[PDB]
Ligand binder design. Structure first.
Ligand SMILES: O/N=C/c1cc[n+](C[n+]2ccc(/C=N/O)cc2)cc1
Ligand SMILES: O/N=C/c1cc[n+](C[n+]2ccc(/C=N/O)cc2)cc1
Lengths: 540, 540
């Protein structure tokens, strides 16, 4: 009862709240501080553990959202606003959340840890679609989600210097993982059965923790949904990270009046600026020329990542690891309305031939003029080279394959061939309540509703089939968190989910129909990006 | 007492509210409906007069703001968000407001009518800087301000057709002027002493009412602040208006695939779309390539404007008309931040020369390469052709002269030479509470707060000299409204404000110093725009 809404951790006491689901109650502890607020002289610095507190911290509501750009492409639109901050912005934002079943588990229960997406420039654990009350009630697992610094506050990097080392947003997530190790037992969770799962930039973070030794010891399984650390958008070099950080300082007036520009006086000048000022100039340090290119992302400093993600994946030993990777059916359609010519969510987006040739440039940026042509060859149907509907879905594939599906398949194949046990999926159900246009199909990020059991919310108009479907998906994710295998341990009735190996390359389709095994995560198209295109780009 | 907060007009009864100033109370009637709500089948149509109502309409708060794009360039910034809507958005927005002194004037009192600016795409009568409580208390005049439809809802035009005739936003203002003729007497106002005053697009609107015979009979004086109808941004051709309206229909899916659209089926399709959907695609109608160019502006159809504003100003007879025109000192700096390269309000905007040549293309669009060169070579100081600070002020003058100062001076000269009595000013005081950077000087729109006596608000950190300066400014505007002459009727000791003539070209400087007469509203620069540039543009 209300006695179970009181919990003591290594820092102090907490009072949680009881959440209601149609199948029973859940105990939530929203707003637990896990780090000292990274404000003032602590801006751009690695997080420090929260010092113990006196009294009872209130943990009945979500805390502040980290300072971030707010999307204004379609004001008043549910499809874009559902990802916007739903609490007020503040640099004081390093807080995590723990859901636990009622009654509290008496035996150590596996823990799922969620990491949010949003290009490393946005995101919050308080979004309605990340509500863990349905996943915890239905599968009796422990769910943990943290906030990490995004944008410049999380990933502005002057490499080498100690005032702005970079990747502090990744260190925020790591500290929250150390917090789970030291404190999840008090909530009934098993610190030896921790399964990370993220989406988009969250999946890239999950993968970047696999490739970082200090973070690897803090978890045991990984789930990467529509994202991977080896993506062309998920990392940046040291020289470019220095250029962008210096450019942002110039846009806000640093250094002032022509004084010195060494990294000490530059960061000190950046620390005196209001947080909103830095955010208001985030998308200027890029040419734009940018969908799918974000200003401040993890850098290859040599610290958090001793080498590039692709190098660490190719040389990695992954025995004893279980991974669940997957993508949605139409990864790239969500990103076309952000600058691809001829595209608009309010019409059919029937683009011309010339608009397709220009859209390849914003979808695949920083590419040579001849390499952009090989993309047009590979994705043009030459029996219908002018059909606008086919060109629309072609550019969607160009952007989806280059940025998500093929970086994921490249990672999934290397893991299975080097000791890891890998399961792959492709989410193919379009929600009956989706506000995006029909031509986008299953857009990026719209499998999250069903993983978190949001259809079970009685205040939402989901179908009865989507409720059974969401419950089936939650069992898949929970079974993987418990046993490292999405298949039910004692049920041969349901169709089986075979592992993904580098040879057969088997995956299953996730929709209202029973499971169906297929071969190849866009095997033909991804050979163009993973195998041929580097050979062509290196010939200069 | 409270009996004066009750007034009957030709439509019904109203209950006003009493506003407080540090020098006495004011009776305000905010939210008076003057037209039937232009919703449903009445979208894009000329306004119909409000039907009489039963009971007492509440007139104690501002009504809704007309649907308009919300500026998001600098979120959380006072300088931009002070012009953003401060009431809920609705197509039901045709309401006006009346301020009147306490006690109510017993004899007919002159009436000032305010028309807000905002490039015909934004603006509202409810903004705090348009609060008429200080002008009415200090000068005992009657102040009226209306809302008019902006953007596509006010100025989308398929010329010729009757489903979308265009200029309905100008007809909104005219209906409010006919309302003042029929009802301002009930508030103590003189319908024979009505003085229009607007700013930016409001000043452009005031000028278009001078050039429209039906609107000319509803007022007797005019004040044009930082705007004129003959500006390169205030009008559009019939062919471009049709191209712009058709483009907006395509962006929202009109007409549906498999259907052709005449002017009827196209507007019928546009009338079924939510208002926010039309707003979300307003800026895609033009290339952008756009500061200083707005999608939906008054069209030259032959109806409201029998010819272009330039033609009607030249052939116009203006005897018996008093006009007060003026500009601010730095008309162009506010708009550079909206697209000129190298410009940022948070640094010094010390642009290179390459950025200067590029900025001329954005500030002066739609001109040939030879024409752009003549602008660069005319505005370059050749002893310092690379000084960034001089290039910044140069580009500020380039867009300030081309869009505001020279259209005003061109208009002011033609009026004084064809019968009108004209007074000119240049506002040269930068408010002590201004949130824009110092290098913007006196930006566009920041004389309004002194005309409306906002410094008198005791909850604002204005200086004592600005309070005296604000009171002195309101007297000029009130004296012009009463007598058609800003000079004090019987105060010969104060410096005099001589009329503006086409030859002497005299104006006064408005700042904390007493009046100083000067000659030439940028006479050398405006000769380049008004006299030579048309001749050079006759060369393809
Ligand atoms: O006129 N300015 C338009 C404009 C629009 C959007 N942004 C920010 N932005 C860019 C890309 C993406 C990609 N998301 O997948 C998200 C957000 C800046 C400026
Ligand atoms: O995410 N969208 C950003 C964005 C959308 C549309 N514009 C066009 N625009 C031009 C001029 C002005 C004001 N001029 O004074 C206001 C707006 C710019 C940026």
């Amino acid at each position: 009862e209300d006695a179970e809404l009181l919990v003591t951790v290594r820092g102090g006491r907490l009072r949680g709240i009881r959440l209601k689901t149609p199948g029973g109650p859940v105990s939530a502890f929203l707003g637990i501080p896990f780090a000292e607020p990274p404000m003032g002289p602590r801006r751009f610095l690695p997080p420090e553990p929260k010092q113990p507190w006196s009294g009872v911290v209130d943990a009945t509501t979500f805390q502040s959202v980290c300072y971030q750009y707010v999307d204004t492409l379609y004001p008043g639109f549910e499809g874009t606003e559902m990802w916007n901050p739903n609490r007020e912005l503040s640099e004081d934002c390093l807080y995590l959340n723990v859901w636990t079943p009622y009654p509290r588990p008496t035996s150590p229960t596996p823990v799922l840890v969620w990491i949010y997406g949003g290009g490393f420039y946005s995101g919050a654990s308080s979004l309605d679609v990340y509500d863990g009350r349905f996943l915890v009630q239905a599968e009796r697992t422990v769910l943990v989600s943290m906030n990490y610094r995004v944008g410049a506050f999380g990933f502005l990097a002057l490499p080498g210097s100690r005032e702005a080392p970079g990747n502090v947003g990744l260190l925020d997530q790591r500290l929250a993982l150390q917090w789970v190790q030291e404190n999840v037992a008090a909530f009934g969770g098993d610190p030896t059965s921790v399964t990370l799962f993220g989406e988009s930039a969250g999946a890239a973070s999950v993968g970047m923790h696999l490739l970082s030794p200090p973070s690897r010891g803090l978890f045991h399984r990984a789930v990467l949904q529509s994202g991977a650390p080896n993506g062309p958008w998920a990392t940046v070099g040291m020289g470019e990270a220095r250029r962008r950080a210096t450019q942002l300082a110039h846009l806000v007036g640093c250094p002032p009046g022509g004084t010195g520009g060494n990294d000490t006086e530059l960061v000190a000048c950046l620390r005196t600026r209001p947080a909103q000022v830095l955010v208001n100039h985030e998308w200027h340090v890029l040419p734009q020329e940018s969908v799918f290119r974000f200003s401040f992302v993890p850098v290859v400093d040599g610290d958090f990542l001793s080498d590039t993600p692709e190098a660490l994946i190719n040389a990695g030993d992954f025995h004893g690891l279980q991974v669940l990777v997957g993508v949605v059916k139409d990864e790239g359609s969500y990103f076309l309305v952000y600058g691809a010519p001829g595209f608009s969510k309010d019409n059919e987006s029937l683009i011309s031939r010339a608009e397709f040739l220009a859209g390849v440039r914003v979808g695949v940026p920083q590419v040579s003029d001849l390499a952009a042509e090989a993309v047009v060859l590979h994705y043009t149907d030459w029996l219908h080279p002018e059909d606008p509907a086919r060109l629309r879905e072609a550019l969607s594939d160009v952007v989806g394959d280059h940025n998500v599906v093929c970086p994921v398949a490249q990672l999934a194949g290397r893991l299975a061939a080097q000791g890891a046990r890998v399961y792959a999926y492709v989410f193919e159900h379009r929600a009956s309540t989706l506000s995006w246009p029909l031509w986008m199909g299953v857009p990026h990020g719209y499998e999250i509703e069903f993983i978190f059991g949001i259809p079970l919310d009685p205040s939402r108009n989901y179908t009865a089939e989507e409720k059974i479907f969401a419950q089936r998906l939650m069992r898949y994710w929970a079974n993987f968190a418990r046993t490292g295998d999405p298949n039910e341990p004692r049920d041969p009735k349901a169709p089986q989910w075979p592992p993904y190996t580098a040879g057969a390359q088997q995956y299953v389709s996730l929709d209202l129909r029973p499971l169906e095994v297929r071969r190849g995560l866009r095997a033909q198209a991804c050979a163009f990006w993973n195998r041929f295109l580097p050979k062509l780009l290196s010939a200069t």
